[PDB]
Amino acid sequence: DSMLKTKQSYLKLNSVENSLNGFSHLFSKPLMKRVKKLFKNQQEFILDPQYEADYVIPVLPGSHLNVKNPLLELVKSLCHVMLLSKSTILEIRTLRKELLKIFELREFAKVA
């Protein structure tokens, strides 16, 4: 929805294309707060016995990745889908670094 809004605004105004440039500015802070809340809740309710139902990793044919923290893969997918822009790469990289700063990880780690 944000991408549609920014493209519509750019069109109404008239390897860079200002149709999309500047779309992550709409939801960065709410995303940061939501990621913080998710991390806190996962930290609190991961080793509980009755709350272990929703943290079970699904298994599907062709899967080969053994992973531990589901929130890491959530944010990794949410950032890799963003990283397909090929024109707003710097903004996406800055957002990815800010998200990774919530975890105690670094920018170029293999786990990230």
Partner: protein, 549 residues
């Protein structure tokens, strides 16, 4: 108590009546590995049982799983079994599913548990006849009230007595783990009562007692006069053997390293003078200049060090240490000399033994590490006899190397300020660094923690908080977490020593693991040392923060 101080001999006699045979092995001893006092007691028992030609076997064990498996392996032929260095704090019968009716005939077997930890399982004594221990003089006087409640707990208004008994039992429990007496001291008391004392036994008793100087100085100070009096009661010929009371200092290998390094690596001097930054080195140089020993002279071996200064070192220290406030470094120790070999002190010998234990030579790798540890224990045991000295010079040089490594890691920790000050307990994690593979040894981790807690105590902070230390073993992807008790400054009076500081980390860990399905492995004989998962460390940590310590 089961076996009081005056009954030891009688129990010993029973052993003979059940073990003294011609062609049958009827005695097996299990020893708490990675412990010096247990090693000394085992050596004394081995000499005793080699005197009367009683056949025996010595088996090192590391974890409770090994204890259970080895006991399951044993045959009914073994009449007598010894458990030195552990077993006091847990109920063996529940652990070992012992049926008294299976071993009635009574006294089919006999298991003698000999441990020093003061909080011990009350049911283990007041419930079972098969299991028996040597009390140090605690059940008679301390437990005069708990035994009544246990005996009573072993018309509708009678629930008050049951409630009172339950409350008394709960009050007795929920106590921290401490040590109040020495196994080698108890064994030497038995030897003195029997009449087989000699110089080797006295030396082993001295080693066993002085092994506690780092952590249980109160016990050491309570026990020292007995050793002094016993040594008093008991031409340089190439076969002489001398045990004397010479002044000694809290110094690291004074007679085997240079005096400069001796002052540099000493934990007490480090704590008092802050040698991790440059002002400490400046103060040390001021100290040396004011004493008057040249910097080039102080950096030579103790053998070639100047004879006159070696003679007047006592007066130099007495006149110079007061200004810097190190007048607590001077104490009285034991020195052993044999012929023309040289002089060794008890502190130096125990440091050499500890370092030789440390360094020498998933589940599969853990088993390999544990068998390496038992092999190191056997090599350290072999190093005891007087016929080997290349197994002691190597230990001394390894002690020097290990102390260097510990200092190099601690200075980096104190630079980085990794010690996070929480509301209840301090915390520090060695996430990354050099030579971190050395710290897979719990005894090395305890050495590092002892230095850290001494440094923390020697400060202006007025907070006594437990410290948690953790490491990394990248091959297994597991954290090795050890809980550490706070310590008072060594220069303190006895009025503020009403009770030693207890350790609640074992209770906290067991409660958290019993109420939450964490992936830990609590099997070490030290109940305050656990192995936890890298992903499981944190939630666990918050749990420990939220649980009543």
């Amino acid at each position: 108590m089961y076996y009081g101080i005056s009954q030891f001999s009688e129990a010993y006699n029973k052993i003979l009546r059940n073990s003294s045979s011609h062609s049958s092995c009827q005695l097996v001893i299990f020893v708490s590995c990675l412990n010096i006092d247990a090693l000394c007691a085992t050596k004394m028992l081995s000499l005793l049982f080699k005197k009367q030609l009683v056949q025996s076997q010595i088996v090192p064990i590391f974890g409770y799983s090994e204890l259970r498996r080895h006991y399951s392996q044993l045959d009914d032929n073994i009449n007598s079994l010894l458990l030195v260095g552990f077993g006091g704090v847990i109920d063996l019968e529940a652990f070992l599913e012992i049926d008294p009716q299976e071993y009635v005939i009574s006294f089919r077997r006999d298991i003698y548990v000999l441990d020093a930890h003061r909080p011990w399982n009350l049911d283990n004594i007041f419930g079972s006849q098969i299991i028996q221990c040597f009390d140090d003089g605690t059940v008679d006087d301390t437990l005069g009230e708990q035994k009544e409640a246990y005996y009573k707990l072993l018309r509708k208004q009678r629930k008050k007595q049951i409630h009172e008994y339950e409350g008394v039992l709960e009050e007795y429990y929920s106590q921290g783990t401490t040590v109040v007496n020495s196994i080698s001291a108890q064994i030497y008391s038995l030897l003195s009562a029997i009449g087989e004392t000699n110089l080797s036994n006295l030396w082993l008793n001295i080693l066993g007692t002085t092994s506690l100087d780092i952590a249980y100085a109160q016990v050491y100070n309570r026990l020292y006069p007995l050793l002094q009096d016993e040594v008093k009661r008991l031409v340089k010929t190439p076969d002489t053997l001398t045990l004397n009371i010479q002044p000694d200092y809290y110094l690291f290998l004074l007679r085997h390293s240079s005096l400069y390094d001796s002052f540099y690596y000493s934990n007490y001097v480090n704590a008092k003078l802050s040698l991790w930054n440059e002002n400490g080195k400046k103060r040390l140089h001021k100290m040396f200049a004011r004493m008057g020993i040249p910097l080039s002279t102080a950096q030579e071996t103790w053998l070639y060090m100047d004879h006159s200064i070696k003679r007047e070192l006592g007066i130099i220290f007495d006149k110079n240490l007061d200004r810097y406030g190190l007048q607590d470094i001077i104490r009285d120790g034991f020195v052993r000399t044999l012929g023309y070999r040289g002089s060794i002190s008890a502190s130096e010998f125990v440091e050499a033994l500890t370092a030789l234990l440390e360094v020498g030579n998933s589940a599969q790798k853990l088993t390999n590490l544990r068998k390496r540890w038992v092999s190191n224990f056997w090599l350290s045991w072999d190093a005891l006899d007087d016929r080997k000295v290349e197994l002691l010079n190597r230990g001394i040089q390894l002690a020097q190397d290990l102390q260097r490594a510990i200092f190099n890691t601690g200075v980096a920790i104190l630079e980085k300020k990794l010690i996070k000050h929480l509301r209840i307990y301090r915390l520090c994690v060695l996430q990354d660094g050099p030579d971190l593979d050395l710290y897979r040894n719990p005894l090395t981790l305890l050495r590092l923690g002892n230095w850290l807690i001494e440094c923390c105590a020697e400060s202006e902070d007025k907070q006594l908080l437990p410290m948690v230390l953790a490491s990394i073993d990248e091959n297994t992807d597991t954290y090795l977490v050890a809980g550490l008790t706070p310590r008072y400054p060594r220069g303190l009076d006895t009025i503020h020593t009403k009770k030693p500081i207890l350790n609640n980390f074992s209770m906290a860990f067991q409660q958290i693991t019993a109420e939450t399905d964490a992936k830990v492995r609590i099997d070490n004989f030290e109940s305050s040392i656990i192995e936890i998962r890298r992903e499981d460390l944190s939630p666990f940590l918050e749990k420990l923060t939220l649980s009543g310590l």
